[PDB]
CSV table of C-alpha atoms and ligand atoms in Angstrom, one decimal:
chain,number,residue,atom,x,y,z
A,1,UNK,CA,0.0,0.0,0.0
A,2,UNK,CA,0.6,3.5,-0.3
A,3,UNK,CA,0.1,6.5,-2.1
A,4,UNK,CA,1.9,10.2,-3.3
A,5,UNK,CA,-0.2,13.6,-2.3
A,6,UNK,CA,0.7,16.6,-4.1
A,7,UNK,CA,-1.4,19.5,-4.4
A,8,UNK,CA,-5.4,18.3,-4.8
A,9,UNK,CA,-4.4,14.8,-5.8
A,10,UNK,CA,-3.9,11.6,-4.8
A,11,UNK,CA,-1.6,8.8,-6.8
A,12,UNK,CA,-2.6,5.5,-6.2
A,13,UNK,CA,-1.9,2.3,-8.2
A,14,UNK,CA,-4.9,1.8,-10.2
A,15,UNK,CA,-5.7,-1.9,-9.0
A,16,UNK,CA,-5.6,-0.7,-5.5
A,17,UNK,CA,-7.5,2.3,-5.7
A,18,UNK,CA,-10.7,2.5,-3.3
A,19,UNK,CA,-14.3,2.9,-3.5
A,20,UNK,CA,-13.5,6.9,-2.8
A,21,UNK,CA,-10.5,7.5,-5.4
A,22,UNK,CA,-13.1,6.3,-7.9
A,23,UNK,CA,-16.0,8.4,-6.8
A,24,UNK,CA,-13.2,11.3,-6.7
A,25,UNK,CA,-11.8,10.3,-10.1
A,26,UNK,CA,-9.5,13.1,-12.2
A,27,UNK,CA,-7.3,10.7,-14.4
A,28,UNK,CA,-6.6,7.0,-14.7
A,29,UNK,CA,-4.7,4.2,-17.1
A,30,UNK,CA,-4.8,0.6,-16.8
A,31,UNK,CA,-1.8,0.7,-19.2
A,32,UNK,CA,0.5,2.2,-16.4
A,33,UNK,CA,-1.5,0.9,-13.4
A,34,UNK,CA,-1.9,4.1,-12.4
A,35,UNK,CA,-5.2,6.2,-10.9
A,36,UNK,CA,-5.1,10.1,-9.5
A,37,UNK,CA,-8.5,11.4,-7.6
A,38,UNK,CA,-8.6,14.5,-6.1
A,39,UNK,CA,-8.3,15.4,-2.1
A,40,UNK,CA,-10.0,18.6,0.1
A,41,UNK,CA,-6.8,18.8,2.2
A,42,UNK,CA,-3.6,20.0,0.4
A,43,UNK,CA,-0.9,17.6,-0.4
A,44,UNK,CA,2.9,18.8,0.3
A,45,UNK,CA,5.0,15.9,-1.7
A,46,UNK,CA,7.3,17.4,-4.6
A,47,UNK,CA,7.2,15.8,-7.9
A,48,UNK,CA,10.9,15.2,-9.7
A,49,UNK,CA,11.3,16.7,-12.9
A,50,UNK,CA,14.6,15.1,-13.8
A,51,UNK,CA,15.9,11.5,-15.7
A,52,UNK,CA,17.4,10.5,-12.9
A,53,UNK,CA,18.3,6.7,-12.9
A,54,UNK,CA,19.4,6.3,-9.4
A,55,UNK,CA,16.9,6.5,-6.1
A,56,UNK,CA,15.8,5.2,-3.0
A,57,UNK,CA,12.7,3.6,-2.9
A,58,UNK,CA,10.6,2.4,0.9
A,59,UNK,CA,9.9,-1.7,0.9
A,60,UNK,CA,7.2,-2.4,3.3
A,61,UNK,CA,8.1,-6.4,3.3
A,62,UNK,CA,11.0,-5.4,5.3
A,63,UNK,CA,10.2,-1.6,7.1
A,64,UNK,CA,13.4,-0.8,5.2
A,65,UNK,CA,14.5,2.1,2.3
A,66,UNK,CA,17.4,0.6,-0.2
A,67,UNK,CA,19.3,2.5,-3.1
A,68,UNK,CA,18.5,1.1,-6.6
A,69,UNK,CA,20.1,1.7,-10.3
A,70,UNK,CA,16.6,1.9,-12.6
A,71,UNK,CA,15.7,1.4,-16.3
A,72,UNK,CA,14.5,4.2,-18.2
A,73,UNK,CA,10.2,4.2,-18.6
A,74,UNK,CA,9.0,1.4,-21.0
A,75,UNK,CA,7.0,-1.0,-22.2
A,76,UNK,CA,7.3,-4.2,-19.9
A,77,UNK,CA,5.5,-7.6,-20.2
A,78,UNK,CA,3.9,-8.3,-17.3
A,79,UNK,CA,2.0,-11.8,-16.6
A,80,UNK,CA,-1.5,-12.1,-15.6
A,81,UNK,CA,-2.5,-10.8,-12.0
A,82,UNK,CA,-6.1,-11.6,-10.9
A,83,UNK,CA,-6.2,-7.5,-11.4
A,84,UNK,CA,-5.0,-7.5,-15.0
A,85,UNK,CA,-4.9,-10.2,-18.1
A,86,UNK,CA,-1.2,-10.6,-19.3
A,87,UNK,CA,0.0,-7.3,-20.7
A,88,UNK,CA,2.7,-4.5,-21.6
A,89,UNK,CA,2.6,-2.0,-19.2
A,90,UNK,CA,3.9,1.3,-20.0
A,91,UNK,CA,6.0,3.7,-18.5
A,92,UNK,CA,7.4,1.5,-16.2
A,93,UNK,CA,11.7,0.9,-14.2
A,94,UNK,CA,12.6,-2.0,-13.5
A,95,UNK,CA,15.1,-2.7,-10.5
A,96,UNK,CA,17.2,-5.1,-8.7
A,97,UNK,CA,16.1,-5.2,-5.4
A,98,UNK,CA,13.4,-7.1,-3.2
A,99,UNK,CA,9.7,-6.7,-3.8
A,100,UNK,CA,6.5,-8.7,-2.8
A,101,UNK,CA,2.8,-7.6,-3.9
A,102,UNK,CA,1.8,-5.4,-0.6
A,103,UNK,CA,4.7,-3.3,-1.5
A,104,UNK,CA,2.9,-2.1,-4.2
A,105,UNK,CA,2.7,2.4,-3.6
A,106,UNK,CA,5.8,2.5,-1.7
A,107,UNK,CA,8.0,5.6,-3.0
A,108,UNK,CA,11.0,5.7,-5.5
A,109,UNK,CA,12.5,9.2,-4.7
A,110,UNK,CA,16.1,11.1,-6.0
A,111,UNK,CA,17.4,14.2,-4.5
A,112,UNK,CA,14.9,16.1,-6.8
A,113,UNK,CA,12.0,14.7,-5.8
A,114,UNK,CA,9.3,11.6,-5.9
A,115,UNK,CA,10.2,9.6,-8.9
A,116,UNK,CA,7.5,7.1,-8.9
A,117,UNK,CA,5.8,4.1,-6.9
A,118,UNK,CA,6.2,0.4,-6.1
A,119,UNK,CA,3.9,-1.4,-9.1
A,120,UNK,CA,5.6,-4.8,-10.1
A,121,UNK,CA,8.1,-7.2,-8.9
A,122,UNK,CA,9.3,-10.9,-8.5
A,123,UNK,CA,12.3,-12.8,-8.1
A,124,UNK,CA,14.4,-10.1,-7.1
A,125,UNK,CA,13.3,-7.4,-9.2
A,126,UNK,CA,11.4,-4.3,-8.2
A,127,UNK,CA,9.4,-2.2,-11.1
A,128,UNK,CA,8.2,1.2,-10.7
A,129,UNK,CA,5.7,3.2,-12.3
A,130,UNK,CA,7.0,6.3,-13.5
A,131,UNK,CA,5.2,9.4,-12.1
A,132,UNK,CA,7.5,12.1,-13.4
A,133,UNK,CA,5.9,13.1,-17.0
A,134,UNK,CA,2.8,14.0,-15.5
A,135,UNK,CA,3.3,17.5,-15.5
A,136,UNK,CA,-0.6,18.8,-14.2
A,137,UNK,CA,0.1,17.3,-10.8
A,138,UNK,CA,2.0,20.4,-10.2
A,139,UNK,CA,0.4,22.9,-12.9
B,201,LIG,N1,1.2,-3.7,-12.1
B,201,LIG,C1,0.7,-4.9,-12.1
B,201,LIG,O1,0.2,-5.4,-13.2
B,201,LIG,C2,0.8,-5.7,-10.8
B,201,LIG,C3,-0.6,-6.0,-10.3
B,201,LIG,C4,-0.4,-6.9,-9.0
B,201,LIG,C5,0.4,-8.1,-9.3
B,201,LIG,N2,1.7,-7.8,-9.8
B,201,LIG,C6,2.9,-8.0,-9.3
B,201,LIG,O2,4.0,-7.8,-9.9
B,201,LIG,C7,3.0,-8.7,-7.9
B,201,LIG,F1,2.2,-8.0,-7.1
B,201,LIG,F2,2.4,-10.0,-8.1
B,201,LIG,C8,4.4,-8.8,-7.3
B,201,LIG,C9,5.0,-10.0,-7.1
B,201,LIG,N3,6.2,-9.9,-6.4
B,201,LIG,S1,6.5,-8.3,-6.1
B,201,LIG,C10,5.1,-7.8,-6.8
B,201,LIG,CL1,4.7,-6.1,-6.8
B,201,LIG,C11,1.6,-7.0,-11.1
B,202,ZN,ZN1,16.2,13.3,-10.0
């Protein structure tokens, strides 16, 4: 679980978002498992606007934060998931480091900012779902 606030907005991934984010729906896209409603209270998390390829990202499977080395955003295959039928997803970074499926939302920051969140993962690998081109969550 877990989620970025910034501004009026909420980031969620899309297959955990809530009965609320839904009702409270400003953008979403299976394709990148991503889903943004909007909030009353003010959110205070910076977006990066960089290409970095280094970060720290949070892993909830062991209440610990490790450095990773990331792929650029792309198209990944990604197997069936009782959420999705076997896909590409888009926009997505893969990682070496350790990742089960409750980590999914935990943050991938640099120094500039909030890169993206926890989305995929298996066998040693961590993926990420890039947050960065969104440019509106700011504007
Ligand atoms: N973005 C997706 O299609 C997700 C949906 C949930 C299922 N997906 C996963 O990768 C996983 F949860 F099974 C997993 C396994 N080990 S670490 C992680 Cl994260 C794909
Ligand atoms: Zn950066």
């Amino acid at each position: 679980s877990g989620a970025i606030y910034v501004g009026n907005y909420r980031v969620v991934n899309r297959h955990l978002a809530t009965h609320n984010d839904w009702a409270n729906l400003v953008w979403e896209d299976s394709s990148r498992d991503l889903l943004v409603s909007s909030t009353t209270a003010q959110g205070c998390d910076t977006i990066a606007r960089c290409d970095c390829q280094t970060g720290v990202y949070y892993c909830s499977s062991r209440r610990k934060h490790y450095p990773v080395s990331f792929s650029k955003p792309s198209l990944i295959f990604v197997e069936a998931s009782e959420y999705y039928p076997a896909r590409y997803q888009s926009h997505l970074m893969l990682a070496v480091g350790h990742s089960e499926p409750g980590d999914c939302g935990g943050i991938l920051r640099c120094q500039h900012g909030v890169v993206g969140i926890v989305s995929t993962g298996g066998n040693g690998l961590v993926g990420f779902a890039d947050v960065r081109d969104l440019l509106w969550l700011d504007e």
